[PDB]
Each structure stands twice: as C-alpha cells, then as structure tokens.
Design an enzyme around this catalytic site. Sequence first.
Site, PDB file in Angstrom:
ATOM      1  N   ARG A 182       0.828  -1.208   0.000  1.00  0.00           N
ATOM      2  CA  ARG A 182       0.000   0.000   0.000  1.00  0.00           C
ATOM      3  C   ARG A 182       0.866   1.263   0.000  1.00  0.00           C
ATOM      4  O   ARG A 182       0.535   2.275  -0.654  1.00  0.00           O
ATOM      5  CB  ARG A 182      -0.986  -0.011   1.178  1.00  0.00           C
ATOM      6  CG  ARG A 182      -0.409  -0.252   2.590  1.00  0.00           C
ATOM      7  CD  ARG A 182      -1.579  -0.430   3.557  1.00  0.00           C
ATOM      8  NE  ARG A 182      -1.191  -0.492   4.962  1.00  0.00           N
ATOM      9  CZ  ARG A 182      -0.861  -1.609   5.598  1.00  0.00           C
ATOM     10  NH1 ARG A 182      -0.712  -2.759   4.951  1.00  0.00           N
ATOM     11  NH2 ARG A 182      -0.715  -1.585   6.916  1.00  0.00           N
ATOM     12  N   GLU A 217       4.151  -0.305   8.809  1.00  0.00           N
ATOM     13  CA  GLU A 217       3.119  -0.006   9.786  1.00  0.00           C
ATOM     14  C   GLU A 217       3.395  -0.729  11.100  1.00  0.00           C
ATOM     15  O   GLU A 217       4.108  -1.742  11.143  1.00  0.00           O
ATOM     16  CB  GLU A 217       1.741  -0.411   9.251  1.00  0.00           C
ATOM     17  CG  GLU A 217       0.607  -0.196  10.239  1.00  0.00           C
ATOM     18  CD  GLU A 217       0.349   1.274  10.500  1.00  0.00           C
ATOM     19  OE1 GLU A 217       0.959   1.837  11.443  1.00  0.00           O
ATOM     20  OE2 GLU A 217      -0.455   1.872   9.755  1.00  0.00           O
TER      21      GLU A 217
END
Lengths: 240, 239
Positions: free
Chosen positions: A61, A88
């Site tokens: 992403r 993340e």
Amino acid sequence: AAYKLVLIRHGESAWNLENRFSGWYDADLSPAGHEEAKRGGQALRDAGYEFDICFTSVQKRAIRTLWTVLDAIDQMWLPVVRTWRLNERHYGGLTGLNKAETAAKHGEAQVKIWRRSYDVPPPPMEPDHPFYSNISKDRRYADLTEDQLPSCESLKDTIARALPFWNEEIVPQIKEGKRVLIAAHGNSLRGIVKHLEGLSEEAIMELNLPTGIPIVYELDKNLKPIKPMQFLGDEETVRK
Amino acid sequence: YKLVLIRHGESAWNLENRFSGWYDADLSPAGHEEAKRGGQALRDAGYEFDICFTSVQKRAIRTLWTVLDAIDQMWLPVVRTWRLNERHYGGLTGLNKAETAAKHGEAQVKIWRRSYDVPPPPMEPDHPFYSNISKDRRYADLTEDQLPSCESLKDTIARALPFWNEEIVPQIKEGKRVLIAAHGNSLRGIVKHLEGLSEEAIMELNLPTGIPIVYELDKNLKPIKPMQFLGDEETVRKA
Ligand SMILES: O=C1CCn2c(C(=O)O)cc3cc(Cl)cc(c32)N1
Ligand SMILES: O=C1CCn2c(C(=O)O)cc3cc(Cl)cc(c32)N1
Ligand SMILES: [Cl-]
C-alpha cells in the site's frame, strides 16, 4: 533552509473498508486510496518538486503510493530503497480482526487502554493465529534476526525500530544534499515526526497525519525544522 | 542458477518503429497489456526473485512494475541504471523509416542497419530531443565520455557489460534469483556475453517482447541449455 524533506502517508486500503487491523498484513490500496495517491502526486507535480532518492516500506500500500507519486511527477527513474523498518505498526493478535470482533473478544476497557497507551503492546500474534504464516513466515522477512521479527508492537516499539533506519540510512542522504521522499505509514511516519519535532509521547499519540497529502519540512543543517510542517494541495484539501 | 530477462513491449506514438532510443517514451496500452501477460506467465509458473535490475527509462521500469505487481513481489529491491538503457540512435531518434531514408538515403541507412561498429550521426542541438535527453537530470553525473550523442551496437554492449560484470554477476553468484527488465539492444549485450555469440549472430538475434526469457546457468555462469520462453503454448511456439 538548508534542506527540504517530503513525507506522504498512504491512503485507504482494502482492509480499511472492512475496518480490520492490518499492521503487517500486506493489504493493497483501495481504488479510493489509489486516487488519493494520484491527487498527492499531482500536487507535487504542480509545485514542481524534484527528488533524488525515495524510501518506503516492504508493504504494497505504501510502495504503490510511491509508484503513483513517481509516475505523476515523471520521476520513475529515481532510486528507491525499501525497508521493513518503515512498516506499519505490528498489531499482533489484533491483526485481521475488525472493530466489532476486537471489542467482543477483549472488551471496551482493554481496547481503550490499548488505543491510548504509548508502550502497552497488544497481544502477541501466536502460531495458531490465522495470519501467522502469512506474515511471520513471509520470505521478505527472512533476513531479520529472532529479536527483530516482532510478534506485536506498541507505538514505542514501532518508533524504536524505525528511528535506526532514519539515523543510519536517511540522515546521511539528507546531509549529502539528496532531496528525500518517504512514502510510508501512519505510525512509522509518527516516529519520524516525533524525532524531528522532539514531541512528547502524548503529543505524538494525538497527531493524526493526513493520508495522500504531501507533508513538507524545511530543515536546517542539523535536520531541525525551521517552521511547522506544511501540506501541499489545492486550498480545499489543504483545509481538511 | 536461474536468470530471467524481459524486454518491454510497444511504446506510445509508434516510437518503437521510430528509433525511440534514449527518448523516455512510455508504454502504449498494448505494451502495458504485454507486460501484464508476461507477469501472469511468471506467476502461473510460480517464479520467485530476490533482486531486480532495470534501466532509467520508464517503458522498462513500468514493465518491471507490472511484472512485480502480477507476481505479488512489489517488495523486492530494484536497481536502476543508465547502463541498461536502449541503444542511443543519435540523429535518427524519433524518425520513422520513410523519414530516415528521405534524410539519409537508402545506401547509408542500410550500412547503419547492417553494421556492428558504425554509429548513426550524432544528435545535434537542432534535434527536437537534444536538450530533452542530453540535459536530463538523470544523466547529470555522467562524464562527457559516458553520455552518448549516438552509439553503434558495439558502443551499447560495451557500456552495458561493465554493469553486468560488476553488479549482476555477484548477485547471481550469491544465489540471488535475478530479474532483468530492459531493452532490445542492452539485452542483446547480455545475451552475447552469456552465449559467446559473434557480432553477426547477435545482430541477427531479435528477442521477443513481453515474454519472460529463462536462462539456466552453471557455476561459471555459462548457459546449460538454450534460452526458454514462458507463456501459454500458443505464444511460446511463436517465440
Ligand atoms: O493509530 C491508531 C489509532 C486507532 N486505534 C483504534 C481505534 O478504535 O480507532 C484502536 C486502536 C488500538 C491500537 Cl493497539 C492501536 C491503534 C488503535 N492505533
Ligand atoms: O536493432 C536494430 C534493428 C532494426 N534497424 C533497422 C530496420 O530497418 O529494421 C534499421 C536500423 C538502423 C540502425 Cl542504426 C539500427 C537498427 C536498425 N537496430
Ligand atoms: Cl521501484
């Protein structure tokens, strides 16, 4: 200022639409999040920004956000460096659960403790977790040491493993005069913003970086901001 | 060892029939679909890579992006180098066949087509691409000797092979599975080194586009069998 640094946080993912915790699960952008990356790249293109090197995570992403940006600014030829240290936050056993499942299994008190805490990690992702092989056995992490592969992270752990990459690989490029772009995630970019502005634990936990919007820092030669971070975009989006 | 090459497909505005060269043409939609098909062939075959090499030209870079997307390996490290760029066609860049013959004559154009070591004329300041290419940011650190105004095929292979020797060979020797997304003439340079082909032989080699090209190499990096192609049987036979 001596230097200028640009960060971008990726937009909506497929699992955001399912309101699932992604963390290290490699969710792709949703069509809307891809459109956001396009708008951010158009902003950089209109402003005439040029870069010399790019950094991103090993999660698609963010990588797709960076690809969309480089396409928009006609700088697909730039060198790109990918690292797990920009990933993340690892949400451990919460990975893959949605809001309702998380509340159902852990209760609203415990979930709020996790949401507001700086250094309390969520439960570990155990071997019988449905995504344990998918993440912890993924060959992209094959070179990590036992201590480096996390089973879970607090925001503190996430920042602690991101800042070493910033100090060892990004800082030298900036001080060499290279114009840096970083395409990454909310919590890893929190680590960088907290280091740059010397923010408190409470201050960083209240900071919500916008998605899909170029964030510009003007930095003196010691990489300390000379003014507040600025957002690029048309008047409307910059407003929000 | 296993090594995969892919040559990009069609570029915009028919430029692959117009000596595209060092002009940074994008893929056409059709060339993009070619890349998707190649990547799908690689996925169907379950290929995995550890490092990828490409040029600084976006039609090759977009081809590699499409393949990485198709095989769910966007996280791989990627190295870009001008040394894998298409051949620089000098003053011919951007001209179609009729314009080339009109400007230079049939005899001369035949000599350039058939010759291994005679360059086309250099790209002059009046050429529409002269400043677009020669003052492009991405070539700023090149020395004057390094940045071509034109190349013979010999020139192209001479500047590609140093990168192969110094950057790709160590990775193949470390056991990393290498993918190379590049152009006709740079890939020619690699194939000529691998197979020890002669100048006439390499000039007769026309590698197919959008098709994964698989090499099986022994401990000396010497091919152990002829290059094989990936895809459904229809397109494999054609190639
Ligand atoms: O950035 C964030 C904010 C959003 N967030 C929420 C929520 O309900 O919005 C719950 C939660 C729990 C953890 Cl451990 C980390 C979170 C959480 N990280
Ligand atoms: O790879 C190639 C083959 C195709 N080719 C043709 C042609 O008419 O097909 C003319 C020509 C001229 C030059 Cl200098 C280099 C070429 C040329 N490189
Ligand atoms: Cl890339």
